[PDB]
């Protein structure tokens, strides 16, 4: 499946991933095409913040979902 991580610019990163994928892994993809260090990333999902050592599966994220990216203050 492929999910999308929208930035607060309205930019959308189309990421191809699997449910076995972890959040930091996802942040790796982000950085391999947006510059953003994983240190500053915060993948949001319906308000809930997504912690690193947890696979997408744990958050019950499905195909074509939409997550958001918000830089640490």
């Amino acid at each position: 499946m492929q999910i999308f991580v929208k930035t607060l610019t309205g930019k959308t990163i189309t990421l191809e991933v699997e449910p076995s994928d972890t959040i930091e892994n996802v942040k790796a993809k982000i950085q391999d095409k947006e510059g953003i260090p994983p240190d500053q990333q915060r993948l949001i999902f319906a308000g809930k913040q997504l912690e690193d050592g947890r696979t997408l599966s744990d958050y019950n994220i499905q195909k074509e979902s939409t997550l958001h990216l918000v830089l640490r203050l």
Binding site: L8, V70, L73
Partner: protein, 99 residues
């Protein structure tokens, strides 16, 4: 100024609204089940903002920050008159189930 099926959560005063970092606006922020209402000190143009469905993520800075959407990503709210974290609690709880 509330819509049908929309109900009040809490009204708290002494709020300020900063853009990025600012050398604000005083008044009273009012949260609701669907909107983030803001009634100003100067009644002439009283009652403005009402996102809540767009606010992507909220947090604490040191005051509560709100990423509502070259330009700033958020606005932040300062609670001069005590009423912080009773609001943070109710703003997170309500905002997350507003999808």
């Amino acid at each position: 100024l509330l819509e049908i099926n929309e109900t009040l959560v809490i009204q708290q005063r002494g709020v300020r609204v900063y853009d990025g970092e600012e050398k604000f606006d005083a008044g009273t922020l009012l949260l609701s089940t669907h909107r983030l209402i803001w009634r100003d000190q100067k009644n002439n143009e009283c009652c403005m903002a009402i996102p809540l469905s767009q606010i992507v993520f909220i947090e604490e800075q040191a005051k509560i920050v709100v990423h509502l959407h070259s330009k700033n990503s958020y606005i932040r709210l300062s609670f001069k008159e005590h009423g912080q974290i009773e609001f943070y609690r109710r703003l997170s709880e309500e905002m997350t189930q507003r999808r």
